[PDB]
Amino acid sequence: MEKSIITQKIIAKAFKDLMQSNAYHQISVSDIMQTAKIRRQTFYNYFQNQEELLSWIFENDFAELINDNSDYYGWQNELLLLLRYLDENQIFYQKIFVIDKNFEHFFLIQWENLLDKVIFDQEKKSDYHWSDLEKSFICRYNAAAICAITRESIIRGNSLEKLYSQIVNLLLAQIKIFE
Amino acid sequence: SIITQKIIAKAFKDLMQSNAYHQISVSDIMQTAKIRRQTFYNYFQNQEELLSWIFENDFAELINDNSDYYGWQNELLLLLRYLDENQIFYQKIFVIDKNFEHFFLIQWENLLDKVIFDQEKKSDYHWSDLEKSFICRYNAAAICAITRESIIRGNSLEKLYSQIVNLLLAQIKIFES
């Protein structure tokens, strides 16, 4: 989305930029709005504080990457863009894994949402005999794997995009047996 | 002498069924085991050491104490059956020991190494070292998470067997030459 959230997106970009090179708690609202080039008080039309801004970033950015697009068959492109986003924002996310103990659970749910999208898109392309139980299992199994691998890579400072071909290939192999 | 240690462990596991970990004493354990109390300390300094011993011994048997040709599929099935038989015990462990998950993950990594080894004995593959390492890390993480969740939920782990095997075989098949 763009038109209904223009200012929020500018403020969030500013914050993400500062998180590349400053510790989270040393970024004030004043700093964010200086970087955004918007009058400070405007921040409060939208967020009470930096925690609320973080929450918004997590909800918006993952939805935008996974769901907010037009594509009929999109999951492979979405996965690539998600890995690229995590690489670009690796320092931000390393920091969040330190600051927010509940983030790991949110992160896993994001991967689950991606797997739900994989299933959604595949069922548009081909016919499958997977039961409801089997679809749940494939999603939970793979979401857990990708969550663990990408969390570790983020924390370690290893590139996520380098894993893309291997992840796609393993997912497609598993999907195929249910044709 | 595996024998006395196993009696003590069996007694502690049974007390853990219906008693909170912290409310089980060495006296309780040894009375249940029917073995003179002081014998405990020939083997374990305390309850935490006893727990650690159970983890190391049980998983070493499940992963390392089989015949060479038993195979990863039977090994997985045996692990799943062990987790079912000890489901209530592990439900508690996932509560009280927030480091057990790391140990558990290593056990699944060990099994995945055996999967690769067994498959390379059966057939021939074009995977690189990096590709096979990745398959192992990816699937060990998946199986670790899925079995923990099923344990906590109180679902059948043995029921997961075919589901896991099918997804693993599907991944390995793409590297077969």
UniProtKB/Swiss-Prot annotation, chain A:
Stretches that traverse the bilayer: none
Annotated HTH tetR-type domain residues: 5-65
DNA-binding region: 28-47
Magnesium among keywords: no
Entry keyword Transcription: yes
InterPro entries in the cross-refs: Homeodomain-like_sf, HTH-type_Tx_Regulator, HTH_TetR, Tet_transcr_reg_TetR-rel_C_sf, TetR_C_Firmicutes, Tscrpt_reg_DhaS
Keywords on record: Activator, DNA-binding, Transcription, Transcription regulation
Entry's Gene Ontology molecular function annotations: DNA binding
Domain of life (superkingdom): Bacteria
Subunit organization: Homodimer. Interacts with a homodimer of DhaQ.
Function: In complex with DhaQ, upon activation by dihydroxyacetone, activates transcription of the dhaKLM operon. Binds the inverted repeat sequence 5'-GGACACATN(6)ATTTGTCC-3' located upstream of and partially overlapping with the -35 promoter sequence of the dhaKLM operon promoter.
PANTHER family according to UniProt: ACREF/ENVCD OPERON REPRESSOR-RELATED (PTHR43479), TETR-FAMILY TRANSCRIPTIONAL REGULATOR (PTHR43479:SF7)
Protein name: HTH-type dhaKLM operon transcriptional activator DhaS
Organism of this sequence: Lactococcus lactis subsp. lactis (strain IL1403)
Protein encoded by which gene: dhaS
